[PDB]
Amino acid sequence: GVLTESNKKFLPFQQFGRDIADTTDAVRDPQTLEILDITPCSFGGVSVIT
Amino acid sequence: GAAAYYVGYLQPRTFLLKYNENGTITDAVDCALDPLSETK
């Protein structure tokens, strides 16, 4: 996925966040304590015109 | 300083919180309090 700095707010005892369906949303690095949203890599479908 | 304290108990019961926009807790309901709560 792509690592984008987490604009949303955390709590002092909150290491990582999740939205739904096990899809972890945000994580804080275990060394410097910086918060980041993690978005799954952009993907789509491909169709043809013949 | 005269003090007052209260003692309550925790049970293994399912609670429905609403995680709000703040990453916080602002209200929740208990799935075993009353018949209506089971619906929620």
């Binding site: 709590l11 990582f16 939205d19 | 709000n20 807790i25």
Partner: peptide, 24 residues
């Protein structure tokens, strides 16, 4: 003694940050 505990007793049962979502 007896008193009615209205709404307290609620906390974060875990260490995961979940936002803007109902969760039971």
């Amino acid at each position: 003694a007896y008193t009615n505990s209205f709404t307290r007793g609620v906390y974060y049962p875990d260490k995961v940050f979940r936002s803007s979502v109902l969760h039971s």
